[PDB]
């Protein structure tokens, strides 16, 4: 995909997930720019799970599948963002193991993605 297609995909991904949850716009604005530095509601955590399920990167237990994530990346992110993403996948592959609940596992993994990102990070 191209950068242009990627940026637009963020909104299409969000539309598939956001209506299932009770979410604040200001929260979603902050995740969109990769700012995970605020306490999340359980709804927002489960939102990150719905998004990550859509990518095929986690199972329903919130377990992060790094081999599958890497195999999917060519279809998830533009070439410009590939290296950053692969670096975040590697650095955060075992984040989920410190948590028990599926929404928590995924949210903390996405937060880790955002904190390890060596460039601009964008969440749907």
- Look up the domain containing 38 and give its range: 1-124
50-84 burial, b if ≥16 CB within 10 A, otherwise e? bbbbbbebbeeebebbeeebbeebeebbbeebeeb
User: Which tokens belong to 27?
Assistant: 């929260």
- Structure solved using which method? X-ray
Using CA atoms, how far apart are residues 44 and 42, in angstroms rounded to an integer?
A: 5
Give the count of domains, the chain.
Answer: 1
Give the CA distances from residue 92 to residues 7, 16, 26, 82, in Å, rounded to whole numbers and listed in that order: 23, 25, 26, 15
Cα–Cα distance, 37 to 114 (Å, whole number):
10
> What resolution, expressed in A, was reported for this entry?
2.0
- DSSP, collapsed to helix, strand or coil, labels residue 119 as coil
Which of these, 52, 56, 26, 58, lies nearest to 40 by C-alpha position?
26
Asked if residue 106 lies in contact with residue 52, where contact means CB atoms within 8 angstroms, the answer is yes
Breaks (C-N over 2.5 A) in the chain follow: none
């Amino acid at each position: 995909m191209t950068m242009e297609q990627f940026l637009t995909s963020l909104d299409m991904i969000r539309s598939g997930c956001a209506p299932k949850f009770k979410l604040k716009t200001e929260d979603l604005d902050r995740l969109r720019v990769g700012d995970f530095n605020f306490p999340p509601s359980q709804d927002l955590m489960c939102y990150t799970k719905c998004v990550s399920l859509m990518a095929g990167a986690v199972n329903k237990k919130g377990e992060f599948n790094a081999p599958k994530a890497l195999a999917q990346l060519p279809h998830l992110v533009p070439p410009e963002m590939m290296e950053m993403s692969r670096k975040s996948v590697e650095a955060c592959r075992d984040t989920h193991k410190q948590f028990k609940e599926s929404c928590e596992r995924v949210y903390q993994t996405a937060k880790c993605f955002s904190e390890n990102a060596d460039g601009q990070f964008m969440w749907p």
